[PDB]
Amino acid sequence: TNTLPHVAFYISVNRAISDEECTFNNSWLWKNEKGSRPFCKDANISLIYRVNLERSLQAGIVGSATPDAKIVRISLDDDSTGAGIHLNDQLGYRQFGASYFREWSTDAIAQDYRFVFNASNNKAQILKTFPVDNINEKFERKEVSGFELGVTARASYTQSRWLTYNTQDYRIERNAKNAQAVSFTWNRQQYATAESLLNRSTVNTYPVDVNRISPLSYASFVPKMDVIYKASATETGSTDFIIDSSVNIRPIYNGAYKHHQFYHGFEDTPRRRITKSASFTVDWDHPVFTGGRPVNLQLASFNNRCIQVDAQGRLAANTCDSQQSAQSFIYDQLGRYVSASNTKLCLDGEQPCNQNLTQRWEWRKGTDELTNVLGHDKQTGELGLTAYTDVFNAQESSPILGYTQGKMNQQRVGQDHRLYVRAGAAIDALGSSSVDLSGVKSITATSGDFQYGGQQLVALTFTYQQTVGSKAYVTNAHEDRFDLITQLKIWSDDWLVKGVQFDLN
Amino acid sequence: TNTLPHVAFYISVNRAISDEECTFNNSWLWKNEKGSRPFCKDANISLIYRVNLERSLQAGIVGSATPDAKIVRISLDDDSTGAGIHLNDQLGYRQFGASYFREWSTDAIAQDYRFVFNASNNKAQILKTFPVDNINEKFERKEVSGFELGVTARASYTQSRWLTYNTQDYRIERNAKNAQAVSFTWNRQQYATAESLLNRSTVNTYPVDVNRISPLSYASFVPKMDVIYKASATETGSTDFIIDSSVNIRPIYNGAYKHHQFYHGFEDTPRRRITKSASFTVDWDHPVFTGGRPVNLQLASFNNRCIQVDAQGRLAANTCDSQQSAQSFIYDQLGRYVSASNTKLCLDGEQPCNQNLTQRWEWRKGTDELTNVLGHDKQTGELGLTAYTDVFNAQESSPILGYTQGKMNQQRVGQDHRLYVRAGAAIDALGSSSVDLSGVKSITATSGDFQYGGQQLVALTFTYQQTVGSKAYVTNAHEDRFDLITQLKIWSDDWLVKGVQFDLN
Amino acid sequence: TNTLPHVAFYISVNRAISDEECTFNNSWLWKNEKGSRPFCKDANISLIYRVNLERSLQAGIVGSATPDAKIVRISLDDDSTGAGIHLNDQLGYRQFGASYFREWSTDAIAQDYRFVFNASNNKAQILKTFPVDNINEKFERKEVSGFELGVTARASYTQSRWLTYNTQDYRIERNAKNAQAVSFTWNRQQYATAESLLNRSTVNTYPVDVNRISPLSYASFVPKMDVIYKASATETGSTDFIIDSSVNIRPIYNGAYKHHQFYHGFEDTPRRRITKSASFTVDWDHPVFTGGRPVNLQLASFNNRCIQVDAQGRLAANTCDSQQSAQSFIYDQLGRYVSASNTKLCLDGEQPCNQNLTQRWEWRKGTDELTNVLGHDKQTGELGLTAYTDVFNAQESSPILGYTQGKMNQQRVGQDHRLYVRAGAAIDALGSSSVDLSGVKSITATSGDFQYGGQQLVALTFTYQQTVGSKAYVTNAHEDRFDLITQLKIWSDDWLVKGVQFDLN
Amino acid sequence: TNTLPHVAFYISVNRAISDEECTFNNSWLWKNEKGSRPFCKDANISLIYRVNLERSLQAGIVGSATPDAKIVRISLDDDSTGAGIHLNDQLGYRQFGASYFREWSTDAIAQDYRFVFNASNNKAQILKTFPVDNINEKFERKEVSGFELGVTARASYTQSRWLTYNTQDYRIERNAKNAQAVSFTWNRQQYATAESLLNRSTVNTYPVDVNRISPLSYASFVPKMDVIYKASATETGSTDFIIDSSVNIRPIYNGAYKHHQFYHGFEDTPRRRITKSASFTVDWDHPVFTGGRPVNLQLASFNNRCIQVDAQGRLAANTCDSQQSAQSFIYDQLGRYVSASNTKLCLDGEQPCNQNLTQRWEWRKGTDELTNVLGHDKQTGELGLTAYTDVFNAQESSPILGYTQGKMNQQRVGQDHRLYVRAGAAIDALGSSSVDLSGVKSITATSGDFQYGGQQLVALTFTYQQTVGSKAYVTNAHEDRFDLITQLKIWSDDWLVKGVQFDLN
């Protein structure tokens, strides 16, 4: 009870880059002549996030030296990194010729394993990060200057300037979105582009060296970053997060010049972006933010005896539920009783919170029982004259269907609970035809990016068949699923509907 | 009882590379002219794995800060590495001539001592590794630029760029297979190929230096890596692992060019792959994952008195068995009783688990005996009004017969328990002729790689003689054995049957 | 009782290299012309081994995190190294001329102070070593490249590659024999051969510098290595070890070429091998492997009162012996009684070991006496209704007579206990003429290497005189002795008898 | 009583190098022409040794992890080094000319401050040393190689090899004599000989620089080394040690060549050896080797009451003596009584040592008095029905007279106790004329090295005058003295008598 409470749960991240999506052009200008072949084999994403909701202070103690706020860690550390990004287990490739007259579409590497950690609204704030700003190392410079007195007469004055600094293969570039978001980009600085991976300058041999293509670029890379948030002491609301496990897949290129045969890398290499987005909606009224661990009010009357309470105020003795935060109580340094569920309000023995005195049924000085400033007959058990309900863990995560982009709003489900799709051959808008939202324990939203443009939820197969969506004008097909209602969400950016979220339980 | 429980047991690894398997070609194009001689002498594999099944958190405590999962360590560390790989105690060799006109088939070195750690299905996940991703060291660059004012007039402007980075002889290259697997390759970077081991450029002297052939390449190398897994909190199932102690045996080559006599190494050197695979099937219902150490319910009636319980629900007082996890109980922070065997369910004093209260027979406040929210006559001992059953150790390991490759499925033994071999001169498929599965305490599956192709179980000598398998079309003969039934396994890849597993006890 | 038990005892190593053995040739081709002179003076071997038999875990505790095995340390550390190897206190030498026309047979140095640590059979395994595999340090490389803009016009592009690595004078080269053995070779890498110790290239002066002949090569070197073994939890047997304090004695050579007078060292220098072997037979049933310290069952009846027990099962109260492991008992975490001698079995109050309950006579809660789940009259003392017997030390070591090589088998002494020598002018085989094995408290096996070839026990002087062995065809005479029966051992390799071991007490 | 016991006592070392001994030749070939002058002024030796006799383990505890032996430390450390060696407070000198034609007999420096630590016999062994063998630092090598592409065309390929290692001015060279001895030589490596101290190569100026003649060579040097011994657990005997505070006094030389005037140093410089030897005879039966501190058996009868016991067995209550080790008792972990003097045997309440039980009179549980498995009348005090006698300090040291060299034997004093000198004009042998060994509390053995050769006891002035020795044929006179019998010692090497030792008290 003397330790900081949290809610710790890994958010499993899985996304398999099928060769249909991996299939890019095999040349720059000879894309049609060179055909199309995949560039990533067995490309799978598994970056096990360590996302925890926590506070940065205790409760009830005078002498605040660390400011009171709400710190949100959506982060990677030593004990949780996942297997990692993958494009190809080895640097596969295939030489081509003209129909730059040479090309080596080497199996993909990535420019940056970028992360975007966004929260839409201003209910919270961002506080710090783990790389502690854009990390700067101390440089150093040397200046030499001398003259020679040579008798053979020679007198030469030379002066050279030195500069040393510590580069990295995959350094960190941190970019802050706004007061509630920050993005991390590991852009390539050492051996950056195809020009930098070049081996010689002035015979036909593979000119892309394997040694300088580090294992961190092709084999596996694990994430490592923290973001810590902030908010008011008495803030309430809900904000949808976007935790992104994102990469920049791109084939290496290299070509010869009609001069010496010089292997010039391409700066304009098409770096396709593929992602995998995770979202968790947070309720800042959670019992994690109390600062003290719950303690229940024991009842000796019957078998299942913990107070299941409602917002009305009356007390009824009922069964005990682990995650029903209304069946245990905090204990404060003011001596009163605060229920585990709601520390924004508090139990009153007179009501809204204040500094009253009769709010107390303190423990026995000595053994473990309760005193007065629980006499009740077995028939009633009501007020008259320990254990934990661990609500400090999160429920099952609900994956998103489609893609996350653009402005986000929370739709209100209609009285009929019918989902309306205002789309035809072209997708314009959706909202809450009519689809019945019952009798379906497993949804299958087979979709991708529409041929007209953008990333959308081009189809929503509603099997019991309510096929609300077109399928004849769809590009690369990233299909997902979600097994099983409270309400519905949407992620239409401007005029294209991509994302959806179903909150259950 | 306050420490994290585990199951610790070395998995002994033994594999002797006989000269029959070691026999490779003695040249590149003169293989028939130069005959065939072995390249590894006394080549034996002993890499004592330290495989332990463990969890990453406690039980019953509020304030989860380390996420709850199941962490599987199949790893090497300081206190367990084994003797190591071996090809030849010294760099033996023999010069040859034409009939590149020179060759030195030096006693084998290895490109990489690769490890593949695979789990087939998605019931679990991978969490971290010991080399913490592909390790990247900080680089550094220096730029100098200066001009000279020489009066003898001379003015020269020179600018040079420096680059320093820390190479290793046997560095680590980590490649992640999928969300439940990762592979470790120590490919050669410093003194990589036969070209790199070259000593001079432009007399007949041994041109492969011994100094740069480090002892880690020929004498002995011990493994050093960790893999740590992950899964859901309430996951159950069975997954077959593949722990591989694998090397890449290859003779060194070097040859002269008909020009100066230049010793050019061969990049296309045939690097034969030989392995030794270890598999252990895990049951995620194991009592290792409880978080609290078992405590038994003492009976003072008779001599051998620990509750041997079944799944029916009735309680009978019987003898005590060390590894019968049904004869002791966990103790929780909820105060109830959970049996050591099954923490997925729990003992109920009313049943499925819940947060009830009458589930308690708590210890005496003071001395060591049991109270109420064990009065029984010596005649019955049933309910009326400490010690450990160490099930935190694994049983004897059952070695595999053949090789592990391709898709894996678990066969169901037939009612007659007859093993059927649907193979003739060519192996097509097997499954569960008819072989009686009784009366044989020692199997001898003498086999190898079939001449038609691939690695198979070409023969299964069933001695009591049921010789189910051909022997006239078999390549290098790696023969194994297995001494002594529950069920049977198989490892047929596409159309070729290689592996088999017999779970006993 | 809370600490890991061991058996610690130095194994004294002594071997004096007499000048008769040290006498090698004084030249390469002029051996007869240059005569024969000794090359090592006062050459004595004393490398005090620190050999200890120990386990790697406790007993009776649930939560096995370090795997249970049997770890054998045959090792050198900081507190035990011995005086060291010695050939000559100073670099003595003598110039010679032709009858390469010059030679300096400098007083011997050694190529390697090699150690072989061998165990014949597979009852145990090897687990780790102290140099933690062949130690590899991190290398580093630097590449520079620049161009000059000189106006006097000059433009030069230069590119140089750097390589740095940490050599040692006497580095460590570890070679693993098999799953129960490993060998350590400190071959010379820095100033390796006579060529490397050379001082100049192009007057008659001593050309072998003393400064680069380090004191570790001629004056003294102490050993430093560990080997740690492994075995099954319930393994029993006996394996003979071979702890070797071995060197490679060799005179330095150097000669001039008939050109400039260049001092070319000889790569083909004859490096004679001289050794000193130590063997200790281990019984894995030793009381060292219990994990808990013995505690005796006190008897208050008579003066000398500790239970001397046999394998029959009956209990008789008799005198107390320090090393009679049958006169004390372990105490377990199961609460029962296990005797100190045999933890493979255990005391039973009903017998073979199990998890019974009536096996207990637990101590008093409070003072120090014994209770029930020792009432006996002084007349009998038998069962009716603390101190240590330190068996955790080894007995006196028995030195070996001759040499250790080839296959090893344990002979069974005949009923008549007569030793038969099936050898004449040439040694063919021995085994158990007839020699009476009694009445001799001191054996004198004066022998060496036979002139016909190999290292043998060429003679066995049996003084009471039974001279079983020839002496007219013996080379360098390394004579030993052994003072004082259970059984007899032998070490005949193929057809030549060298070693013998006499286990007493 | 829980700490390791020792016997700690400095051994004061004093030896004044008088100018009579310091007087060497003033040239190489002009010794008679250049006369004779002293080279060391105020040359005094004071190296306070820290010699302690100690053990390496406790007593009575099971679980031996550090091997049981007897460790002898004859060593220097931080808290005890002495003032140091001295030849001259400043580099005095005097130029000379011919009658190499120049010489500068600079005030003496020393090649090595060598130490020899010898024990004659094999009753003990050597175990380790403080410099932990001949110390070897890790070397490093760098190889660079590059080509230039210069257009003015120039193409140069250069390759250079680097080598770095850490030298010392006075490094340590450790040489091991045998299994009971080791010698330490700090031979000069940096600025080694007169050639190395040279300043220029090609005016008459002092050519021996003062800066490179470090203060450690002329002003003062203190010793720093440890030697640690070993022996059997039950070894008894006596061995005479030779602790040597020895130097190698030598004048610096330097001379010009009749060419340029080049100052060539002399490699053949006469390095005279002067010493100061310390010897202490050890009795391995000392009470230091018990492992437990003595505790006495209190008697309340009379004033001076501690049991003075003899070897007969009877007990008599008498006075208390501090260093009479027979007046206190050890206490063991077996619970018995062992006397402080003799732990080889032990007190028996039945006798030779065994594991009996009635050997116990244990202390009171509670207050401090003695119980039974001391009732006696004041008249007798004998057996019927704490404090320390610190014998863990050594007595006064007896200096040696003469020199220590050659074979050593212990003479047995004759019945008449007459010392016989079998020497005349030439010393042949001595042994035990006739000299009465009484009435002389101060001996004066004025002697030195005899003119015939070697270091001897050329005279023994026996003042009460028994002048047993010649004085007309004696070289440099190192005279000593010894103030004040048990027995007598001698140190005749082959046929020349040098040393003598008188053990008193």
Alpha carbon separation from A73 to A8, A82, A348, D75 (Å, rounded): 10, 17, 34, 60
Beta-carbon count within 10 A of D219 CB = 16
Subunit contact D134:C220, Cβ cutoff 8 A: yes
Percent of residues in chain C assigned helix, strand, coil, to nearest 5: 5, 35, 65
Alpha carbon C231 to its chain centroid, in Å, reads 19
Contact, B495 vs B454, CB < 8 A?
A: no
Nearest to C168 by CA among C137, C206, C129: C137
Asked if C193 has any chain B CB less than 8 Å from its own CB, the reply is: no
Alpha carbon separation from C45 to A406, C222, C271 (Å, rounded): 82, 10, 18
Q: Resolution in angstroms for this experimental structure?
A: 3.5
Subunit contact B48:C125, Cβ cutoff 8 A: yes
Contact, B244 vs B276, CB < 8 A?
A: yes
Interface of A with B in 461-480 (CB under 8 A): none
Instruction: Give the max Cα distance, chain B.
Output: 119
Ramachandran quadrant class, B228 (left: phi over 0; alpha: psi -120 to 50; beta: rest): beta
Report residue C299: phi and psi, to 5°.
Answer: -120, 125
> Which one-letter DSSP state was computed for residue D80?
B
Half-sphere exposure of A478 (CA within 13 A, CB side): 21
E strands along B424-483, which residues?
A: 427-431, 435-436, 442-443, 448-449, 455-456, 461-462, 466-467, 482-483
In this structure, chain B runs to a length of 505
Subunit contact C145:B161, Cβ cutoff 8 A: yes
Handedness of CA D259, D260, D261, D263 (dihedral sign): negative
| HEC letters along C213-234 | CCHHHHCCCCCCCCEEEEECCC
Contact, C359 vs C372, CB < 8 A?
A: no
E strands along A186-232, which residues?
A: 227-231
| HEC letters along B244-306 | ECCEEEEEECCEECCCCCCEECCCCCCCEEECCEECCEEECCCHHHHCCCCECCCCCCCCCCE
Alpha carbon separation from C236 to C122, C232, C239 (Å, rounded): 11, 9, 10
Partners of B324 on chain C (C-beta within 8 Å) are none
> Which one-letter DSSP state was computed for residue A406?
S
Find the residue in C nearest to D65 (Cα): C8
Asked if B139 has any chain A CB less than 8 Å from its own CB, the reply is: yes
Burial of D325 (0-12, 13-18, 19+ CB in 10 A): buried
Asked if A168 has any chain B CB less than 8 Å from its own CB, the reply is: yes
The structure was resolved experimentally with cryo-EM
Non-local CB neighbours of B163 within 8 Å, separated by 6+ positions: B139, B141, C142, C143, C144
Percent of residues in chain A assigned helix, strand, coil, to nearest 5: 5, 30, 65
Subunit contact B149:A167, Cβ cutoff 8 A: no
Report residue A233: phi and psi, to 5°.
Answer: -70, -35
Report residue D22: phi and psi, to 5°.
Answer: -70, -20
Burial of D185 (0-12, 13-18, 19+ CB in 10 A): buried
Non-local CB neighbours of B114 within 8 Å, separated by 6+ positions: B183, B184, B185, B186, B244, B246, B247, B248
Half-sphere exposure of D119 (CA within 13 A, CB side): 25
Subunit contact D147:C158, Cβ cutoff 8 A: yes
What is d(CA D496, CA D407) in angstroms, rounded to the nearest whole number?
Answer: 11
What is d(CA A255, CA A272) in angstroms, rounded to the nearest whole number?
Answer: 20
What is d(CA C378, CA C303) in angstroms, rounded to the nearest whole number?
Answer: 12
Contact, C265 vs C253, CB < 8 A?
A: yes
Percent of residues in chain D assigned helix, strand, coil, to nearest 5: 5, 30, 65
Subunit contact B9:C357, Cβ cutoff 8 A: no
What is d(CA A148, CA B151) in angstroms, rounded to the nearest whole number?
Answer: 10
Bridge partners of C315, per DSSP, are none
What is d(CA C218, CA C222) in angstroms, rounded to the nearest whole number?
Answer: 12
E strands along D381-451, which residues?
A: 418-423, 427-431, 435-436, 442-443, 448-449
Residue with tokens 């096995």: C64
3-class secondary-structure state, position C478: coil
Contact, D109 vs D217, CB < 8 A?
A: yes
Report residue C289: phi and psi, to 5°.
Answer: -95, 25
Half-sphere exposure of D411 (CA within 13 A, CB side): 23
Asked if C160 has any chain B CB less than 8 Å from its own CB, the reply is: no
Mutation target among A7, A160, A214 for the B interface, most CBs of B within 10 A: A160
What is d(CA A288, CA A53) in angstroms, rounded to the nearest whole number?
Answer: 7
Bridge partners of D35, per DSSP, are none
3-class secondary-structure state, position C20: helix
| HEC letters along B172-227 | CEEEEEECCEEEEECCCCCCCCCCCCECCCCCCCCCECCCCCCHHHHCCCCCCCCE
Alpha carbon separation from D83 to C337, D11, D114 (Å, rounded): 64, 14, 17
What is d(CA B443, CA B432) in angstroms, rounded to the nearest whole number?
Answer: 17
Nearest to B29 by CA among B273, B272, B266, B199: B266
Residue with tokens 């192709």: B453
Burial of C454 (0-12, 13-18, 19+ CB in 10 A): middle
Non-local CB neighbours of A403 within 8 Å, separated by 6+ positions: A275, A277, A455, A456, A491, A498, A499
> What tokens does D199 get?
């300043």
Amino acid identity of B103? Answer: E
What is d(CA B378, CA B375) in angstroms, rounded to the nearest whole number?
Answer: 10
Long-range contacts (CB closer than 8 Å, 24 or more residues apart) made by A318-323? A319/B355, A320/A389, A320/B354, A320/B355, A320/B356, A320/B357, A321/A389, A321/B355, A322/A389, A322/A390, A322/A391, A322/B355, A323/A389, A323/A390, A323/A391, A323/A393, A323/A395
Asked if A390 has any chain B CB less than 8 Å from its own CB, the reply is: yes
Q: H/E element holding D272? A: strand D272-274
Percent of residues in chain B assigned helix, strand, coil, to nearest 5: 5, 35, 65
Find the residue in A nearest to B233 (Cα): A9
Breaks (C-N over 2.5 A) in chain B follow: 99, 152, 202, 259, 350, 373, 385, 432, 464, 484
What Rg, from alpha-carbon coordinates, does chain A have? Answer: 31
Asked if D148 has any chain C CB less than 8 Å from its own CB, the reply is: yes
**What is the bridge-based pairing of β-strands D102-104 and D157-164?**
unpaired
Alpha carbon separation from C107 to A495, B299, C88, C246, C263 (Å, rounded): 94, 79, 6, 18, 18
Nearest to A421 by CA among A411, A413, A429: A429
Q: Does chain B touch chain C (at least 3 C-beta pairs within 8 Å)?
A: yes
What is d(CA B433, CA B421) in angstroms, rounded to the nearest whole number?
Answer: 6
What is d(CA D315, CA D348) in angstroms, rounded to the nearest whole number?
Answer: 12
Contact, C179 vs C192, CB < 8 A?
A: no
What is d(CA D419, CA D437) in angstroms, rounded to the nearest whole number?
Answer: 8
Residue with tokens 């990469």: A247
Contact, B391 vs B341, CB < 8 A?
A: yes
Non-local CB neighbours of C349 within 8 Å, separated by 6+ positions: C356, C358, C359, C360
Amino acid identity of C333? Answer: Q
Subunit contact A9:B145, Cβ cutoff 8 A: no
Half-sphere exposure of A23 (CA within 13 A, CB side): 12
**What is the bridge-based pairing of β-strands A247-252 and A238-244?**
unpaired
Nearest to B126 by CA among B185, B67, B178: B178
- Which residue in C65, C69, C355 is closest to B320 by CB distance? C355
What is d(CA B82, CA B75) in angstroms, rounded to the nearest whole number?
Answer: 12
Bridge partners of B281, per DSSP, are B240
Non-local CB neighbours of B462 within 8 Å, separated by 6+ positions: B435, B440, B443, B468
> Which one-letter DSSP state was computed for residue A290?
G
Work out the minimum CA distance from B456 to partner chain A, whole angstroms.
26
Contact, B481 vs B445, CB < 8 A?
A: yes
What is d(CA D211, CA A43) in angstroms, rounded to the nearest whole number?
Answer: 70
Amino acid identity of A184? Answer: F
| HEC letters along D119-178 | ECCCCEEEEEECCCCCCCCCCEEEEEEEEEEEECCECCEEEEEEEECCCCCCCCEEEEEE
Q: Does chain B touch chain D (at least 3 C-beta pairs within 8 Å)?
A: no
3-class secondary-structure state, position B467: strand
What is d(CA C83, CA C103) in angstroms, rounded to the nearest whole number?
Answer: 32
> What tokens does A375 get?
């006499």
Partners of A306 on chain B (C-beta within 8 Å) are 355
3-class secondary-structure state, position A252: strand
What is d(CA D86, CA D45) in angstroms, rounded to the nearest whole number?
Answer: 7
Subunit contact D66:C8, Cβ cutoff 8 A: yes
Report residue C135: phi and psi, to 5°.
Answer: -65, 130
Burial of D388 (0-12, 13-18, 19+ CB in 10 A): middle
Non-local CB neighbours of A75 within 8 Å, separated by 6+ positions: A49, A50, A51, A52, A130, A225, A226, A227, A228
Nearest to D23 by CA among D52, D50, D7, D43: D43
What is d(CA A183, CA C217) in angstroms, rounded to the nearest whole number?
Answer: 61
Report residue B59: phi and psi, to 5°.
Answer: -135, 130
Burial B424-434 (b: 16+ CB within 10 A, else e): eeebeebebee
**Terminal CA-CA length for chain D:** 29
> What tokens does D11 get?
């051994």
What is d(CA A144, CA B133) in angstroms, rounded to the nearest whole number?
Answer: 42
> What tokens does A336 get?
């009163």
Nearest to A176 by CA among A114, A123, A126, A247: A126
What is d(CA A229, CA A75) in angstroms, rounded to the nearest whole number?
Answer: 11
Report residue D64: phi and psi, to 5°.
Answer: -65, 110
| HEC letters along A256-289 | ECCCCCCEECCCCCCCEEECCEECCEEECCCHHH
What is d(CA A361, CA A338) in angstroms, rounded to the nearest whole number?
Answer: 11
Amino acid identity of B40? Answer: C
Contact, A80 vs A53, CB < 8 A?
A: no
CA angle D133, D135, D140 (to 5 degrees): 145
Residue with tokens 């994403």: A45
Bridge partners of B502, per DSSP, are B488
Breaks (C-N over 2.5 A) in chain A follow: 99, 152, 202, 259, 350, 373, 385, 432, 464, 484
Alpha carbon separation from B146 to A157, C146, C493 (Å, rounded): 10, 12, 74
Asked if B407 has any chain C CB less than 8 Å from its own CB, the reply is: no
Contact, C83 vs C316, CB < 8 A?
A: no
Nearest to B333 by CA among A322, A365, A332: A322
